[PDB]
Amino acid sequence: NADVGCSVDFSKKETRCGTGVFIYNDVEAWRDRYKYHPDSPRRLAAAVKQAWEEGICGISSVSRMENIMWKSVEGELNAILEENGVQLTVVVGSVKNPMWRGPQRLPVPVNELPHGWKAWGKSYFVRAAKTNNSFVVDGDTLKECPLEHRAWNSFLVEDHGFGVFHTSVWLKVREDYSLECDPAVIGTAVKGREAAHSDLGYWIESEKNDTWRLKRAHLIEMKTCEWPKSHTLWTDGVEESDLIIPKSLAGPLSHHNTREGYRTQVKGPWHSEELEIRFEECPGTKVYVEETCGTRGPSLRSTTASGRVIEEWCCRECTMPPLSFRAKDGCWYGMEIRPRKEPESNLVRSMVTA
Amino acid sequence: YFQSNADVGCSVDFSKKETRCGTGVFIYNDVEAWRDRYKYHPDSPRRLAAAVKQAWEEGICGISSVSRMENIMWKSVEGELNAILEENGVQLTVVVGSVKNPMWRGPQRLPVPVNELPSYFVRAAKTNNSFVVDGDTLKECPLEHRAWNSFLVEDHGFGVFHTSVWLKVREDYSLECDPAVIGTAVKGREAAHSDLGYWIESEKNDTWRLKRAHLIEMKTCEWPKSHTLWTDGVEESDLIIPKSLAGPLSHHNTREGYRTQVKGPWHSEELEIRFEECPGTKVYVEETCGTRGPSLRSTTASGRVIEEWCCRECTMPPLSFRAKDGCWYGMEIRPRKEPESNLVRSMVTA
Numbered sequence: 257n258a259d260v261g262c263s264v265d266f267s268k269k270e271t272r273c274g275t276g277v278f279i280y281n282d283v284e285a286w287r288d289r290y291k292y293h294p295d296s297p298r299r300l301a302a303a304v305k306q307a308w309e310e311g312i313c314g315i316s317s318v319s320r321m322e323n324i325m326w327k328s329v330e331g332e333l334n335a336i337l338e339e340n341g342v343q344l345t346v347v348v349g350s351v352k353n354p355m356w357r358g359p360q361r362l363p364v365p366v367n368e369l370p371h372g373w374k375a376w377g378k379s380y381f382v383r384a385a386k387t388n389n390s391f392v393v394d395g396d397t398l399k400e401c402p403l404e405h406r407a408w409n410s411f412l413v414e415d416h417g418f419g420v421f422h423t424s425v426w427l428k429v430r431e432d433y434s435l436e437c438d439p440a441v442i443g444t445a446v447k448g449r450e451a452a453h454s455d456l457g458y459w460i461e462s463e464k465n466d467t468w469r470l471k472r473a474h475l476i477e478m479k480t481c482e483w484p485k486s487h488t489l490w491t492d493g494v495e496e497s498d499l500i501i502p503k504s505l506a507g508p509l510s511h512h513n514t515r516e517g518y519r520t521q522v523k524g525p526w527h528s529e530e531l532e533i534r535f536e537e538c539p540g541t542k543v544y545v546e547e548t549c550g551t552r553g554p555s556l557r558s559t560t561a562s563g564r565v566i567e568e569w570c571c572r573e574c575t576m577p578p579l580s581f582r583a584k585d586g587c588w589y590g591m592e593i594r595p596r597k598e599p600e601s602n603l604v605r606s607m608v609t610a
Numbered sequence: 611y612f613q614s615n616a617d618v619g620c621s622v623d624f625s626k627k628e629t630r631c632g633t634g635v636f637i638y639n640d641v642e643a644w645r646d647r648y649k650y651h652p653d654s655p656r657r658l659a660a661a662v663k664q665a666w667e668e669g670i671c672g673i674s675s676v677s678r679m680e681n682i683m684w685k686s687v688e689g690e691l692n693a694i695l696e697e698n699g700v701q702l703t704v705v706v707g708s709v710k711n712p713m714w715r716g717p718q719r720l721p722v723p724v725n726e727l728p729s730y731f732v733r734a735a736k737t738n739n740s741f742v743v744d745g746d747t748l749k750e751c752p753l754e755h756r757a758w759n760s761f762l763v764e765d766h767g768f769g770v771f772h773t774s775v776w777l778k779v780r781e782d783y784s785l786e787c788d789p790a791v792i793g794t795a796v797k798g799r800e801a802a803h804s805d806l807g808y809w810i811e812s813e814k815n816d817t818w819r820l821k822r823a824h825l826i827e828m829k830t831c832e833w834p835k836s837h838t839l840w841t842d843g844v845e846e847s848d849l850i851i852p853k854s855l856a857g858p859l860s861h862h863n864t865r866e867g868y869r870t871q872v873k874g875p876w877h878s879e880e881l882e883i884r885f886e887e888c889p890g891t892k893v894y895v896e897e898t899c900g901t902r903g904p905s906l907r908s909t910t911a912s913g914r915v916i917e918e919w920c921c922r923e924c925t926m927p928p929l930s931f932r933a934k935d936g937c938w939y940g941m942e943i944r945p946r947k948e949p950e951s952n953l954v955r956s957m958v959t960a
């Protein structure tokens with residue numbers, strides 16, 4: 257509440273300074289400035305060892321930055337485990353979207369794993385030998401560790417740390433059970449006729465038109481924790497079935513997360529690595545409102561597998577401009593928006609149900 | 611023109627341990643700033659004059675300003691409005707007085723003038739008909755015949771020494787506070803609900819709760835839920851700053867062991883809500899205490915400190931209000947031994 261800053265205020269036509277609350281868009285910024293780090297690698301190693309002994313065979317990361325943290329500390333955790341004679345290998349793979357919940361939780365260990373004080377030699381520097389027992393973090397590893405035996409949402413941000421090139425975000429294993437997204441990295445603000453619900457992976461803009469409505473959003477992850485109402489604007493009398501970004505995808509439970517003529521986009525292209533929600537026709541396409549249209553269904557891409565653009569689309573009672581998702585492989589339409597003449601079986605469809 | 615999600619700036623971020631720049635949303639504390647950097651101005655003095663003239667002809671005899679900034683605007687345009695009215699042969703004089711708190715509602719509304727009228731230096735003779743804005747004028751123009759909340763901010767305008775805020779007479783009837791000048795933000799463990807008169811801080815303890823507030827006006831419009839955090843499951847009787855005093859309808863405007871402070875010292879020109887003992891006093895939680903009543907000041911009218919206070923089931927540190935005349939206690943907190951009849955009490959009920 258007591259940060260000091262200066263800014264160009266475009267809506268108030270002034271450049272000024274003062275104290276206040278400043279919410280930065282670090283989602284769309286090309287500069288990477290935050291890195292997650294364990295509060296204590298030796299304590300995290302002990303939590304992993306205990307988790308494994310309790311039948312927790314791996315991790316489903318909540319967020320893109322958690323997976324990056326696991327990848328950067330993998331070698332260190334394995335060296336600590338080997339230093340203590342623990343036959344266990346942390347194996348960190350890629351994130352797949354959506355980042356589905358797991359039901360287990362890392363335990364808080366009483367003690368960290370200590371230093372071994374082994375003879376001076378290459379063991380202080382080289383990676384640990386691979387073992388028979390893989391503690392798998394994300395990756396394509398469901399056969400060896402099914403999702404129901406993985407821990408998810410076990411961390412809380414303990415503090416931020418100063419750094420010259422990156423700002424550290426220290427993560428600690430929490431004691432409490434929670435489904436909620438970590439509020440330490442959430443920033444939500446409204447000013448005049450625009451608002452943003454944000455964290456390190458979601459930048460969700462709303463605006464006052466005739467009513468408040470979703471304006472645009474950019475998501476560089478697809479997480480499944482619950483966005484906390486404490487950090488959400490205008491939460492009363494909201495119907496979850498009207499929330500554009502579903503609750504089950506960390507959508508804010510807010511009138512700001514709604515748009516007339518659209519219901520919750522549970523079958524959007526949430527397999528995508530990142531998505532922009534934009535109310536605008538896909539390139540080369542037109543949408544027509546007509547009750548004869550097909551019904552809501554899986555989101556469809558505007559281009560076929562061969563690259564052919566589908567020119568004409570419809571929706572039974574949605575509103576213009578149309579809801580679209582912009583992804584690396586092209587432009588996708590809201591669930592309401594179906595091809596007008598083309599069979600849907602010729603198109604690329606979302607296989608995800610959030 | 612009205613986009614505020616893409617400002618650019620730099621800041622010292624104490625909780626994230628960084629000084630950095632970027633794009634985003636910046637919510638400034640303009641309440642506790644050293645100066646007024648904003649000035650309300652009518653979008654058109656001549657249009658406002660026409661609205662006043664027609665209002666007078668409809669039996670609206672004056673104005674109750676919604677905000678401190680609106681009253682300052684009326685004072686600045688008074689002479690010009692009266693010149694315009696005199697130029698058009700209208701036997702009417704706008705008379706602007708000071709604001710009293712609370713700035714109570716009125717049920718009338720300025721009309722959007724059907725016919726427009728066809729100056730900054732003219733010294734208009736006073737007429738026999740007074741259109742009174744605020745002031746100690748309730749006898750000649752009762753509250754039930756005054757317009758209130760008739761303006762909407764149309765736009766901001768650049769200025770070297772002050773940023774202009776242009777006000778237009780609105781068509782629609784509303785009780786809502788103008789959202790054009792509201793900023794609300796939460797980041798991590800702290801939040802603020804703010805406009806040009808209220809700075810309301812909340813924090814995450816075991817639960818989210820009111821931390822502190824600074825108010826430089828006491829207004830009575832409704833704080834819009836659109837600009838409010840966490841509005842569901844809220845009991846309005848738990849809102850520390852009452853709904854009827856533009857309190858946000860939020861869990862952030864609550865504090866365990868206190869209910870809504872309808873009889874706080876809202877006649878104050880400015881106040882700080884602070885959870886802290888009044889100087890030289892102690893509060894004991896004990897069931898033998900008196901029940902909730904009008905807020906009492908910690909000092910007698912002659913400045914003597916009442917040392918020992920109690921509450922039946924409030925929480926420590928105690929809810930207090932800091933004003934120019936001293937330190938006042940939340941409704942729950944009563945003198946432990948001294949009779950209340952010896953103390954200074956709030957006479958207002960929000």
Ligand SMILES: *[C@@H]1O[C@H](CO)[C@@H](O)[C@H](O)[C@H]1NC(C)=O
Pocket residue numbers: 343388
């Ligand atoms: C590791 O696994 C092999 C089988 O591939 C097994 O024979 C061996 O005993 C194991 N090593 C241990 C348990 O130390």
Ligand SMILES: *[C@@H]1O[C@H](CO)[C@@H](O)[C@H](O)[C@H]1NC(C)=O
Pocket residue numbers: 464465466576577
């Ligand atoms: C609302 O949005 C529509 C289309 O998105 C636009 O044409 C219209 O001007 C807007 N109305 C407002 C901002 O009052």
Ligand SMILES: *[C@@H]1O[C@H](CO)[C@@H](O)[C@H](O)[C@H]1NC(C)=O
Pocket residue numbers: 738
């Ligand atoms: C002026 O108003 C007073 C009432 O305050 C009235 O008694 C008087 O007759 C009026 N004089 C005029 C209209 O010349």
Ligand SMILES: *[C@@H]1O[C@H](CO)[C@@H](O)[C@H](O)[C@H]1NC(C)=O
Pocket residue numbers: 814815816926927
């Ligand atoms: C809550 O505030 C009290 C003081 O009122 C403080 O002692 C305590 O540490 C705080 N608890 C948390 C969880 O911040």
